[PDB]
Design a protein around this ligand. Structure first.
Ligand SMILES: Nc1nc2ccn(CCCc3ccc(C(=O)N[C@@H](CCC(=O)O)C(=O)O)c(F)c3)c2c(=O)[nH]1
Ligand SMILES: Nc1nc2ccn(CCCc3ccc(C(=O)N[C@@H](CCC(=O)O)C(=O)O)c(F)c3)c2c(=O)[nH]1
Ligand SMILES: Nc1nc2ccn(CCCc3ccc(C(=O)N[C@@H](CCC(=O)O)C(=O)O)c(F)c3)c2c(=O)[nH]1
Ligand SMILES: Nc1nc2ccn(CCCc3ccc(C(=O)N[C@@H](CCC(=O)O)C(=O)O)c(F)c3)c2c(=O)[nH]1
Ligand SMILES: *Cc1c(COP(=O)(O)O)cnc(C)c1O
Ligand SMILES: *Cc1c(COP(=O)(O)O)cnc(C)c1O
Ligand SMILES: *Cc1c(COP(=O)(O)O)cnc(C)c1O
Ligand SMILES: *Cc1c(COP(=O)(O)O)cnc(C)c1O
Lengths: 461, 459, 461, 459
């Protein structure tokens, strides 16, 4: 036994499952706003010998030896991270060791806050992420709701926008110490300047969680949150088209010096670094760190800006093709990579639409809309451009995807009229032959349309 | 841009750094007790398209769709996990989504304990891990000591073993809600039955964190902590030789003045803590790679593997004893050796830097006696990594020979030098010293390069 | 040495200070809304041998013996407490062991909440008490702000009322577990029904802190908070005219039983009692408990309702006599025992008015007003009726007190024009002979007017 | 209604209950170690018009006016406080606003510690007070164990003394921020110098809670904890014989690689914790009464008083030893005696109920050995109360005689009875037993009524 046997040679059971997952990715139209297809160059570094190296600590401040090579790889990842987002290495540092986006956020809170210090983020049904302090009326859901006291700021139900006025009012009372400016389901751009005004007033840290829009920020196709934020966390994947990892950007240098004359310095670096390790994480995923450095240099290139520009064009094309077919969009449309469709004005919900679209090899996700009246049957979908755009989808290709969706939406509408509760709805798509065959037809037309496009990564897995 | 280019063609700067580390691993004698060389079969799954699938939730309970295949992958991983440790699915469940061992431990505390509830683990300088609640005398270090109140238990320095009696004494007073039985630097078997008795008395959950020995447990070459622990966490790398991920095993079934059978309530709380509480979408590429490794751990090859890991560390132990070195607790019953170099006149900090310069990677270790602040006078040496490279007993005796030459080099430098930075700068500047190091480095790298190396050929 | 020597015989130094304090109380016009003059019957029980008895525990559940007599006294105090506020002993229990009002409030939080559970009270500058969770933008002030997470609800600056609409909005976001309905400086009555609506919606406990208005509630001259509140704490003194102690009223019996049929019972009693002892307090002040039982039976009598009716008449008389002399009142006037005067529309502040009135033997307190612009110089006074009303002051006597105040207010106005900062203002009243003698004149006329009225308690101390 | 009526005329129901307790105190042998009989001079101030003054804040820093006189009263109280304990105002301040001893201790923790910071005190069954962080095995009992994390230290049951060595061992592991040196049921002197050494090592504040012995310390008849403690709290009653209030003494001055003298930062934090943090307006009537008592404690009368308190408890100790009773730690060096009745065949719960029925008030006490849940087999007997009634050595020997008759009565009932409620019901129902109790009660009450009683004549 050498450990050099191939995967297809030594574990055929796992090899098939790998192929069937690649086949499902190829034959399907992935429209999840957070998903993307990773480059082969990054996947070759993700499954590399860097997995074997334990390198606890930081470059030049590690606690083992033998880290001579992973030091260069992390600092290359740090330099590629600052270059990708056009940051001055004198004003910004970046930690590239977080295991994912969730650990990146929790590291920031641990770094800058004490347990039960106060946190403000967009509520999850309104478009905020779990790690922004999601707490329901019955349960503390996220660990950020347990180890810290969080109060959500809400959308304006009449506009679909963040209610920046209500947030300013409720922040003067809640007196938070950190406010997250970041979304998981919000089709418009965040007024980071208005967020900094609120944070500057209530003396709170302004954290920007550009996880969903990191690639669009790097390509300079939307306003960058670094002009206003003190801390910026992001997800390595999603729009950046990398492996699964996380980043924490922090201001460094001089914050302010009335009468003193001595520059009051930024104190984020040592706190952020200590929270990531040794506080929260163990050994860094060096194979991830190298895979994201691969993807970060890809984001510095002229290729990547043309890719992000197509994502906004495709999102805009998806927006108009849905509006011009009888669908409403919350906030009216989009300014980024995603669309938030309202399907109450169509007669369907998000849950049954997700199930009927999943059965035709179209992957979306339900999303709470402002005008909802329940949570098991939300009235909207969330559709993302970046996934199919990496398959060289263009505007006219996304309008054809919308034609495939409204086809399935109408099958669900017809099935909803014959059913009532959701479980017998889902049970209907599995037994009724007329609905079963009509689903298999739409899926076969969808799989045919999808397989023709290229797919990043390897050929077979 | 097709996204299908080679790494060598797309990014040659990074592809060169990949081959630089591949050579550093092939040419070095890797003695870090927690490091292993992952197989190629697992790495192929690790760097696969599964990185693309967002499968938040659990098999059959996802929050999007399209998780058709990865549901089968996560379920295959759970089944291979229970199979590798001889567990009955009716009595044991397992969560395979922890990103690493540290998130695995933080998940258990979040699942079973309230903020500031009390935790007890082996102190870090005494051999415990950070995530066991390590607190300094001046600062809360691990987040386990921030969100939970930790009090450590200690080694008996006379014997180098866990003072199970002082643990019993202090747990009665501290009244912890959870006690951790698991070590990062400990050469002996942990009395899990004694831990369970202590936990039963103060009504505490017994968490066995078997990250360093999970492979030995899987091969059934050392006693299994599953016969005594309520919760078991492990890293999927180290002795398990998988990709970097984490596992949380938990009890299912019955935990019986009414004839009422009280059930186990771990599954829902443990799974909810991993997601949605702590993590986000799981790394399905890592899950699939550790499923490749867990399949390897159920094979007679892995039992031969772990049997040799024991034989090698015992051979390295006996060799060090023959050359006049002291071992904490006198020897080893598992995969690592704790060397006390204070007798031979050298500390661990100096020995670590000299051995690093000759491609012998180890880490310093505080010995029972000298406290945390004092420069550690010991080293922690591990067998698993080189054993994966088909090392045998006489090969580790050669590694001990190389270590001896390195130590005696460090001794002559210490005789020529004063402070530690003077020592570290003398190793790079002194012409004779840097030459005798270059010689030993060459003899080490030639010896190390001859052995096979799991993984790919070039990266 | 027997310990039976009189105080005047054994400690003349302390005896004089006792007399000079009684003389200061007699010669002065006490207008502090929280102060009152205690009956001699209660002071005889306050300084009784009950101080000597340690009786940790509760009647029938004590941990020493020899508590046969203090058991009857506490239950008499419990029965007199339920009778004074017209409560059914089947629906309400009362703990009479709290040392004061602050410990009574902290006992309720400890009983019903975990550390860092969420609390909502009126902000201190808006009229709420310290123990309702007062936290500033710089410091956690009250222990209720430290051991629990509190967010204040505010007044409406345009009306002077509690902004019940903003409170309902911010409670849906803050998700509190307890809301305090109680004030220390609020001239109108609290909509306890609207408070119960908010608490019933966000699933929070409704605590009523009638400390300032307990005597008015007992005399049934204002709406009682027991019709809506789950927990009611109060101060033994203030309007109830007792010694210094505290009470905690809690619902007991049956709270609700859909489908169950088994009555879901109230669970406050064992929790409230355990928090007071053994959690928070040590041995009960049995000499206080007996003094408040004395004062609680006085509150059941027809005498006491005529006393409380005069307090509202005197507060109303003080309100109109100030309005009809050029003073503004926040909320316009009063419906209880206190008046909240606005002295920005007069040219003075609350701090310099408190100092000039203190120098004429008139005791008041500064109070933040809605239209303020600082905190060292608040723009208002808080004047209370219950103190002088216990001296048999009537409406025409309170209008004469207002004439004495506006006299001093105009001396401060004249001194403010000659000064600038507050410290040289206060320094001016001490040196300048023209202002010094004019102050001594107004004080002598005030001391003459005050000494003529009767004074409850003893003659000399 | 003038509000100047007598209590007898205004409320005869309550005035009768006042005289019922006055008689119960005059006729009973008060042996509760924490109870004393307050002088009339203090009670006159206790039930004075100072109950009317709301003086929130501190002398010179009030938040209303009219505090002209009570500022002098609170300042006179602070000066008499420092004088009674031989303290230098340059090295010691004092807060006199604590409502009782329990609020006094909660103030110190709030002043110096963050929520969930670590506290160490003597365990409650071992002699520590509730406010030292008492936690059960099933429930957080004292609020000190809710808002702060407490770990207790224990008696050495072999000697009945504080195990200062196990304290040192466990404080190194638990790392408390504050340690409490103070007892509610402990017959021996606390080694404050050893506590200070432990506190200096783990960098902890030493709080001496001298509620039970403050009078002995004031009379300088036992060593003063002010020579070793950072913070000192006390009740103003118990041995100080004042009205029920509390005191917090704290260090002022200097607490000296730069020639920098680090100052003490207790005054502002301690005062801010008492108000505005925890309390509201102070009870100026209680403050004035404890100022009356502190003046009494500076007199040669109080030194004679406390000297007799020691002599009386030693006489009660020697008497109990002569009759064959066991004493925890073998005797007493202060004001109380811990009797072990497990040898004589009776528990403390039974002895407490029998002695209560014959007007001998004491409280049961858990002995070193039997745990908290077991019915306590001991009693805590105190000297201060009866010593204030001019008891002398031969008088306490008579009290021991009465206790012996009571115990032997309880033994015969235990021989006639099974469970504890059967024991308690037998004492009221059995005709002969209830008669022999009535006889002993009469002989006790006649003996007790003859002695003078501090306070008023009738109430
Ligand atoms: N805008 C926005 N869009 C998306 C899309 C995906 N995600 C990622 C989080 C997905 C997620 C999973 C589980 C829960 C959850 O609560 N589960 C509990 C319920 C128990 C209860 O609530 O009582 C359970 O079923 O176990 C949740 F709330 C959210 C987000 C996001 O975070 N934000
Ligand atoms: N037995 C055992 N062996 C090993 C070998 C590797 N590890 C895993 C991490 C090793 C480790 C330990 C301490 C610190 C630490 O204290 N760091 C702070 C100092 C702050 C302060 O003290 O003020 C710093 O960054 O300097 C650390 F950063 C990293 C372990 C383990 O966990 N246990
Ligand atoms: N409506 C209403 N009226 C009244 C009238 C009296 N009281 C009773 C409380 C009096 C009070 C004392 C001290 C502070 C206070 O903060 N002090 C700190 C400042 C440090 C800081 O704030 O940074 C300091 O000087 O030490 C305070 F805020 C309030 C109330 C009430 O509670 N409510
Ligand atoms: N040495 C020493 N002697 C004395 C003598 C008097 N005291 C002062 C208070 C005595 C005390 C002790 C324990 C509990 C107690 O536990 N109560 C809970 C049970 C809850 C549970 O255990 O679940 C209940 O109400 O039953 C208590 F209520 C009161 C002390 C002291 O503090 N120390
Ligand atoms: C290595 C280890 C961990 C953490 O594993 P990471 O991958 O570094 O997070 C936890 N516990 C023990 C005993 C370990 O050895
Ligand atoms: C996707 C996302 C994250 C990261 O989630 P992970 O699955 O842990 O990587 C964090 N914040 C936001 C706003 C996100 O959309
Ligand atoms: C009696 C006592 C207390 C508390 O005094 P209280 O008046 O009951 O609050 C605190 N500590 C000790 C050691 C005590 O003996
Ligand atoms: C006066 C008051 C209290 C009690 O304060 P204490 O001085 O501790 O008695 C409590 N709540 C309110 C609203 C008060 O006005």
């Amino acid at each position: 036994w050498t450990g050099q046997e191939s995967l297809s040679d030594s574990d055929p059971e796992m090899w098939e499952l790998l192929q069937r997952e690649k086949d499902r990715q190829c034959r399907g139209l992935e429209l999840i706003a957070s998903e993307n297809f990773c480059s082969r160059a990054a996947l070759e570094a993700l499954g590399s010998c860097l997995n074997n190296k334990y390198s606890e600590g930081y470059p030049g401040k590690r606690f083992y030896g033998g880290a001579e090579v992973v030091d260069e790889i992390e600092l290359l990842c740090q330099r590629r991270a600052l270059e990708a987002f056009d940051l001055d290495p004198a004003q910004w540092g970046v930690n590239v060791q977080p295991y994912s986006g969730s650990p990146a956020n929790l590291a920031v809170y641990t770094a800058l806050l004490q347990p039960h210090d106060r946190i403000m983020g967009l509520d999850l049904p309104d478009g905020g992420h779990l790690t922004h302090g999601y707490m329901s009326d019955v349960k503390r859901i996220s660990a950020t709701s347990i180890f810290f006291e969080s109060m959500p700021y809400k959308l304006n139900p009449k506009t679909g926008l963040i209610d920046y006025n209500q947030l300013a009012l409720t922040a003067r009372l809640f007196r938070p110490r950190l406010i997250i400016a970041g979304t998981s389901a919000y089709a418009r751009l965040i007024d980071y300047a208005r967020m900094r005004e609120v944070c500057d007033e209530v003396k709170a840290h302004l954290l920007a969680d550009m996880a969903h829009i990191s690639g669009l920020v790097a390509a300079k196709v939307i306003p960058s949150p670094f002009k206003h934020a003190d801390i910026v966390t992001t997800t390595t994947h999603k729009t950046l088209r990398g492996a699964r990892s996380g980043l924490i950007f922090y201001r460094k240098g001089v914050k302010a010096d009335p009468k003193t004359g001595r520059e009051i310095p930024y104190t984020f670096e040592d706190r952020i670094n200590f929270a990531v390790f040794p506080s929260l994480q163990g050994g860094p995923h060096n194979h991830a760190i190298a895979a994201v450095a691969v993807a970060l240099k890809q984001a510095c290139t002229p290729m990547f800006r043309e890719y992000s520009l197509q994502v906004l064009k495709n999102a805009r094309a998806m927006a108009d093709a849905l509006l011009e077919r009888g669908y409403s969009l919350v906030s009216g449309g989009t300014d980024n990579h995603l669309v938030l469709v309202d399907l109450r004005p169509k007669g369907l919900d998000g849950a049954r639409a997700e199930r009927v679209l999943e059965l035709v090899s179209i992957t979306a996700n339900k999303n709470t809309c402002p005008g909802d009246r329940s949570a098991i049957t939300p009235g909207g979908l969330r559709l993302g451009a970046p996934a199919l755009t990496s398959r060289q989808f263009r505007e006219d290709d996304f309008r054809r995807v919308v034609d495939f969706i409204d086809e399935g939406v109408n099958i669900g509408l017809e099935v909803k009229s014959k059913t009532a509760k959701l479980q017998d709805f889902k049970s209907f798509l599995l037994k009724d032959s007329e609905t079963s065959q009509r689903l298999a037809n739409l899926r076969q037309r969808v799989e045919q349309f999808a397989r023709a496009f290229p797919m990043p990564g390897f050929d077979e897995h």
